[PDB]
Symmetry: D2
Subunit: 440 residues, 4 copies
């Protein structure tokens, strides 16, 4: 499953449908990024630019021109064919092949953008530009507008209105096509296989980074070369650090390990967290915390559907957490009073759900306190956790326990579809999986 | 093998020894780098900052103050301890632990750098600063100097002299300590194991990226989490593209695959290229080109020693290449005339050797045409190649063949030590290795 | 005659009337400008900021908020009262006195603009901002919008639409109120008195700058402290340089002097050019060129009215010029063919008319080739000239003659009113004025 | 009196004498400065650039190259000859005429600076650059150095050392040549004539700006077109504001007027303050304050000589002031205790003396608290004042009195020479001058 030229074209058209007549939208590629000295990081295209192109080169700009309500066309600026640069650094699409390959009407050399962009904007009423997204892009846009403003003697005129297209595009991205959902389903499966593998490989004495290695190898073998974010492998007290990515410690017999990892597959992210015993067996204390987090996730998965909200479901989770913590003596008092005091916050300090798509923590408006009403096509994580610090004023057996369990779901007409349920999370199933692996 | 606190301190002292009395050297950490939206790439410390600290955090500045020829001290600016930021994003060294951990005299909060830096520079004659290395660093330095220049009424004075420390530091980095060489030896071994693994795993029908996966997994298992540069897996015609990193193609029965990959181990790079048949057996045409490249490497490895140069050894390689290409009918004419015409350049278009250390294409002055006389402690690659384009005007059987073979060496008192010879390169040894693997 | 608080308020209201509901307009003051080291040039307020305020301080921002179609209000950011800064550098309006003095609803300290501006823009749909007018302003606006864009968790929202208010404001400025015209009339009178004075003072052997001195003194005595542009005193060959401002030469018996000078009176510009003989008597050659330029001006003054255009009147001037130049042997051939060839351009190379107001070369759309139809309330210069270079291929007696004659007019219901006719321009009147002065 | 080509050359040579062998000094012209829209302020050359050139154009750079201790040469970058630009905006020196006119060895087009500057710096050890003086200059220098740093394959090398030449040049400027002193003497005379004129013209009912007009006209007539700083005409309570430049008030019968004004003559500044009664007669209260300020100035003029300091002389002035204020009941207590408490500071809040030259508040090191030992050739102001605020807690008759009296002096072998004593300052002489003028 991937995204086709025809879909990128439909997206461009859907944006054009929302634009004023006499306007142009400018969408810029990500710059290349230095790792050290003359070496660059592996290229990651800007998500919005990707969304409208599927084109994985820097020094590229998509220009959508809406002349009026019937006439529109597209111009791509992109790197020219150059034998020498290509022998050295790789093949370039170039101008001749781009229109057919990408489905754009015209292609021009990026090297000519300053000579050409102002000509495309001349006489328009509106320019759609994500101001402040990239410095290099702002420079190009501001220079073109300045030429037009200052060019009255050459009969040039600048569009006086600049609109940030990010709100409109981010609303588009918030609602996935069936094809996007198919890609996300595969990302979920790949990510799940990686997590299963980490559970099956984990042994006391291995380093946290060894599990990262197993995960990244599994991503790669299914064609997801890169993770969607830096893999977290937090064992023991490291599990209480939310974005722990050092992954430098030896994993101890008797500790839990929390793994938060996701692949990037054809542009789309998986995002799974599983927490499990390093030695294959939850202690009683570990199991007691684990059960609360799992009940939180399982209830959330029953509830998520069109017409509810992240906020509403979060309320249910908070009650489950407070109730469970009171039962274990971690919190003390009346459950309703404790809920009213947000007494769970020292142990569950983050949100339950984030949008998912081309990015983790994907784009799109949440509403105040994530109160936006859910509709079919929205894709989100469900990630309850409890983190009991090593020095927390709680019964000693719970100190240093960090547990999160996270699935990715898509809202459907009738509820939700869980994209990541093919990696186990019930404690007895985790133990059985690890017992079986440990016998080999 | 790694680098100790005591060694980082010796390096700081060696720099101070070269500084004028009444001076300060300012060494800035790398900024964090966005991958997409709110996700950052895995952090890579600035190599020069690393060289003097072994400290892997952003928002840090090392200040070496040489008050006079006997008195000097060090101040580190680094991120403060912060419970919340650390629960979220990871542990920070902070100010209390830094002096003992890093061996610096004093540590201050990075948040205070603008309030404190000018006070450290006040009254000095010279500031050593790598101007233009980082924008954020230039802003900090320029602001401090401006405060001093403008502060005569507060009895402040700016150092009038600014010296770029990069030439001095890069000369330091060019000559490796025994401890650095030990780390580089391990990087070489790890990188070699990865290349051996790629040869043993390669089969027709696998994707180029599968070999990348095997390599990165092997790096990781030995504790080299990250590659030192983006892995190149160029099969068939892709092998003729020097920095081919797409790695997207299905590897064909009958093609060669060129793999250029290296790990980063405790800050130090491996850098190995091996080229081998996807199906385990060189064709005659492939073998004929391979032999020339191998003879080039083997001769280079015999020759490299103190008192010669990259330029001198390159001359020997050029003769081997021209002679071999004439013998195969790829070049036509008199060898000496062809050498005089640089007739090899269409097929061997890059340098034979690059410095190696904390970076691939490491720092240090090469001399005109890489004519600098080699001395013990220098570390370099040896990377002859021949690339015959698909459309080259040569006997048809050679078209689309890209071969490079690269080892990493250290110049010793008596010659050189090859750090990467534990992965095979003789064609009969490559074939035997692959035959053995293919029987499993 | 000046502009009152009530008029500045009417202007603000007229802008608000044109704004979308749920919007804010941001109008920034000019920065102070260094002349040398710690000395600044005399402050000149930004014309658009002045137009809406009559407020002559830097570090000030006018914010017009249109909450909806009935509710709107104004906020001024301006420098705080500060005893010490004021003892040193002058009085400041401050926040307490500003609402009554300027007629704005609220005033806040400029020092608080970054803490307050985003709060004013939060939740609005549209921001009107002259992007690129001033760097310091762009920084403030971009920072506020970035806070809002990034502030969804604090329930902040940025206006997605940014509109350049310059086209709307410049159209406002193009049409003068009766009060503006009264100020411009006085500027014209003051400027005329200065030019009369220069003619009455001019003698052979005086320096060009002496006439500048007389002019500036005359401006000052009527309360126009500053010129509206750098005074031009171009005698002999210097008269052939359009913006000659060196004014460094000794004025020679037998040469013409061209004086282009205008005052700034209560914000509004005069702009007059007169050319006259240094010795009080036109030579025959000088008179022959002068007559053509004068006929051009006199015809233009008869013609300018509502419903014609600068382009149309320019056509009449071009015919007068070509006809006259043919008559003198400066041009050769058929007048209509020469007109068709724009054969006048070597001698008359600039436009006939420019808008006049708060600036010379005032704001407002001219139309292609200055073809915009004139309407009552427009104010413009009328400035024909002929410049015969010292090396021009023309009868020798004309070489080195530069003549321009310029009046300022306002278009009225029935024609135009000449604001600068109180300084003579008929050659016999110039001679009589100078003869009378030279007898004293 | 002016400065000759030969002197500019001696200055360049004196700088070169202080430079390291294998170095270049870069001195940049001031940018042109916008007043409003398309109109620029009258051009003021950068004082340091002027000091080495006497060249009054923007877009110019002086490059002094010291190849070694015997060989050096100069290159000027400056605007090219261009017929059209010159017809419009004025004559340009160009490249052909510059070497002879300015005494530089070579001249190149400013438009070529980026193509040429790096070539001039290539291989040098040291670049002298005033970093942060101008943004446009920093851009040019940083770009050239970056080309060199990055150009090792083209055998380019950047100078690693950058030295701010401002301290050395400012020390040069601090000591005036006899020719500079002659120019300063003329500036003093011109400025004095202007102040005499203001006293002779002043009448009750005139505006403060009228006196500015008289002053500027007097500057102009002697060939000092521009003031060296914005003229201050502070009558009544406005005299208590140190840099009062509004000059907007009607001068009242019974008030004092303080005039601080100076011309710029051939690059060099005058700087005179006189305070006098608007109606020609000091009141008793006015005279009582005036006498203290005058005694302060007269004592300072007796004392200033080589081997004393501004600090030492200031001590004498403070005692005179405290003693006088105690005598009038403005201060109360023991003089020595009051001196120890700096009890004069509410009434005399600024320094006694500032360096004078190409700038007011001229360049050069003062020492802590202006303690530097004076030597022949130094030029400075002497400017005691007393300012009694309208609301000061003092005998009512003194409130709202602002008096400053300022002369310009040059330190000589035997004492000082007063450059501005040709405008009167003894109260009886002021009254006699004004009485005589008021009878006309
Ligand atoms: Cl291109
Ligand atoms: Cl910090
Ligand atoms: Cl303020
Ligand atoms: Cl030029
Ligand atoms: Mn996650
Ligand atoms: Mn390599
Ligand atoms: Mn004019
Ligand atoms: Mn003064």
């Amino acid at each position: 499953s991937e995204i086709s030229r025809q879909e990128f074209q439909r997206r461009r058209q859907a944006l054009v449908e929302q634009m004023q007549p006499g306007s142009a939208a400018l969408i810029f590629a990500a710059p290349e990024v230095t790792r050290s000295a003359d070496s660059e990081y592996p290229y990651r295209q800007n998500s919005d630019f990707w969304y409208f192109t599927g084109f994985n080169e820097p020094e590229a700009v998509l220009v959508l021109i809406k002349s009026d309500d019937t006439h529109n066309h597209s111009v791509l600026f992109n790197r020219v064919r150059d034998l020498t640069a290509e022998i050295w650094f790789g093949r370039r699409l170039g101008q001749d092949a781009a229109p057919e390959k990408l489905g754009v009407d015209r292609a021009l050399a990026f090297s000519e953008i300053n000579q050409q962009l102002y000509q495309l904007l001349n006489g328009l009423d509106v320019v759609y530009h994500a101001q402040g997204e990239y410095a290099y892009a702002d420079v190009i846009v501001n220079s073109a507008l300045e030429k037009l403003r200052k060019g009255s003697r050459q009969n040039l005129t600048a569009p006086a209105t600049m609109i940030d297209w990010r709100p409109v595009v981010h609303e588009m991205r918030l609602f996935k096509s069936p094809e996007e959902i198919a890609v996300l389903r595969r990302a979920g499966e790949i990510t799940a296989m990686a997590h299963t593998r980490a559970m099956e490989k984990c042994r006391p004495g291995m380093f946290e980074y060894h599990l990262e290695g197993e995960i990244h190898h599994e991503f790669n073998r299914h064609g997801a070369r890169y993770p969607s974010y830096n893999t977290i492998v937090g064992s023991g007290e490291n599990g209480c650090i939310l974005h722990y990515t050092e992954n430098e410690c030896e994993m101890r017999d008797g500790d839990l390990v929390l793994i938060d990892a996701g692949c990037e597959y054809k542009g789309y992210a998986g995002d799974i967290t599983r927490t499990f015993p390093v030695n294959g067996k939850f202690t009683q204390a570990q199991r007691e915390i684990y059960d609360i987090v799992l009940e939180s996730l399982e209830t959330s998965l029953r509830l998520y559907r069109p017409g509810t909200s992240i906020l509403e479901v979060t309320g249910e989770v908070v009650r489950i957490m407070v109730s469970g913590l009171v039962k274990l003596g971690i919190l003390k008092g009346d459950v309703d009073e404790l809920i009213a005091q947000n007494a769970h916050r020292p142990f569950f300090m983050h949100g339950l759900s984030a949008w998912l798509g081309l990015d983790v923590h994907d784009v799109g408006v949440y509403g105040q306190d994530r109160s936006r009403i859910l509709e079919p096509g929205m894709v989100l994580t469900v990630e309850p956790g409890l983190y009991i610090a090593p020095d927390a004023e709680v019964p000693e057996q719970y100190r240093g326990i960090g547990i999160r369990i996270e699935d990715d779901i898509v809202i459907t007409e009738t509820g939700n579809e869980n994209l990541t349920a093919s990696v186990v999370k019930k404690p007895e199933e985790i133990e059985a999986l690890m017992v079986a692996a440990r016998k080999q």
